[PDB]
Design a protein around this ligand. Sequence first.
Ligand code: THU
Ligand code: THU
Ligand code: THU
Ligand code: THU
Ligand code: ZN
Ligand code: ZN
Ligand code: ZN
Ligand code: ZN
Lengths: 131, 131, 130, 130
Amino acid sequence: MNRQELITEALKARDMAYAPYSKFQVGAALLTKDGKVYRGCNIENAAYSMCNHAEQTALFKAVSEGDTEFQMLAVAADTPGPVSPCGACRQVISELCTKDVIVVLTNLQGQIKEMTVEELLPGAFSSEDLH
Amino acid sequence: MNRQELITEALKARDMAYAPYSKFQVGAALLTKDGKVYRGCNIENAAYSMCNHAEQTALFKAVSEGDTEFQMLAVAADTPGPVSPCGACRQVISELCTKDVIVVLTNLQGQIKEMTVEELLPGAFSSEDLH
Amino acid sequence: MNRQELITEALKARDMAYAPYSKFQVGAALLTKDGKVYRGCNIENAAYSMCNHAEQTALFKAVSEGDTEFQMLAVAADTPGPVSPCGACRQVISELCTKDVIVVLTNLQGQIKEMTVEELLPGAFSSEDL
Amino acid sequence: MNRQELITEALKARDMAYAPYSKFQVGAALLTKDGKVYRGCNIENAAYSMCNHAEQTALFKAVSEGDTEFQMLAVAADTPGPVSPCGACRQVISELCTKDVIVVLTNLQGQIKEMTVEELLPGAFSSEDL
Ligand SMILES: O=C1CCN(C2C[C@H](O)[C@@H](CO)O2)C(=O)N1
Ligand SMILES: O=C1CCN(C2C[C@H](O)[C@@H](CO)O2)C(=O)N1
Ligand SMILES: O=C1CCN(C2C[C@H](O)[C@@H](CO)O2)C(=O)N1
Ligand SMILES: O=C1CCN(C2C[C@H](O)[C@@H](CO)O2)C(=O)N1
Ligand SMILES: [Zn+2]
Ligand SMILES: [Zn+2]
Ligand SMILES: [Zn+2]
Ligand SMILES: [Zn+2]
């Protein structure tokens, strides 16, 4: 699975976005160790605090299906450069993804940036901290 | 698809729960107008505010797949009586479900309580209030 | 302090709102049993899921100061009728407020609707269920 | 009001923490440019998603009071090394704090780690992207 295919999935996932309030659509595609792909998109709500992001939707669909081993995650939005995952999403990524998972960031014009789960949120807060 | 079958789906969904911090597992099963079922469970995080709930997981899974028409949602947890959806979930339910969708609440001992969206969240805040 | 005076505080609190994304400002004023008032407003973020609501701001401000016994909460927004608290806020209210606390809902034109935590959120999920 | 004094504030703020579910208390102290200090702590809820964190209570209290100019933020928890702000909080920090605000992380052992807002969350998602 070369990142380009996963990116293609994230771009399709982005079209399923329910973002009538921000008008900002985000798509994500998660690749399991066994090669299965899970798509995700942001889903908004009139009461802003309830909004769920693309990265999390993809991860939560996988986990709720029994898939917890991942190798790559692609995220795409219509930004000048590769889209930047928000802090909350990086946190969820650091919790559900091993530190070696590859995070592929992109947009709708071919700009790509890659980084590991660790580099995305260095020294992330974790279950270990809770002693 | 009877409600008793949906309940069994929610119970199965509950086993996929990732609740290592609260140790409280919740499951949910959403039924589309076309008879398709989407399972959901709660997925926690070391940083508590990140946690996603079973009801929301099922709905987000459905919506991210293109299914936006629903008829029934079942929720189950190991509580004294039927499990009670939290306020945040009721809000997401009132936004993504039509006012007629049937919400089936239950537990691990056959106790069942049924109700509609409006009854679940009286005069819910909505997109209408944003003009 | 009557509800009219608490409402005056919620309306002032509303002006502190940081809602550049939705342009929808909400204010709230919480009255403790000892008569102290805590103001709250919604504070938004470019990443939508981080948004904090007025009702919650007022409640969190109070609790983080050591005040945990309340008697009344007022909420105001620019809606045609009294503003309706969202489900997440109703949940936080049911957890931090006793079932008797009076919830005063209003807008910017004098319309007022009053109600209890229980009718605000029917058989709310609670710590008992854990 | 040097940093050691802000750290003390965050430590006191930590005692106000309402964390009956995780038993993990966190405190934070925000210093405005005018020298005013705002305390924050984490406040949990039976329904885990509602939980508010210490860093966010302090910033929300400040903003809801009209203070939006800050210079330093201290955060403390009972961890082996300085406490690490979660991603959600770093996001809120990057939105409400200027890139030059100093973030002071510590624990109960005097171990201190300092860093800037930009360093805490490099190339953070922002309003410009919308
Ligand atoms: O991490 C990224 C940054 C934020 N967006 C969101 C939430 C909201 O629906 C929209 C505007 O912020 O994009 C995402 O979905 N993922
Ligand atoms: O609406 C219901 C009530 C709350 N639970 C959650 C989230 C958390 O992981 C656990 C304890 O609140 O159950 C749900 O998943 N759904
Ligand atoms: O529960 C109420 C209804 C919604 N608003 C919010 C959050 C957001 O900044 C804006 C749009 O939903 O109003 C509140 O602050 N409280
Ligand atoms: O950013 C930090 C990390 C997480 N904690 C929280 C929320 C929760 O109540 C508890 C356990 O994670 O500490 C904070 O309050 N701030
Ligand atoms: Zn995000
Ligand atoms: Zn819920
Ligand atoms: Zn609310
Ligand atoms: Zn945090």
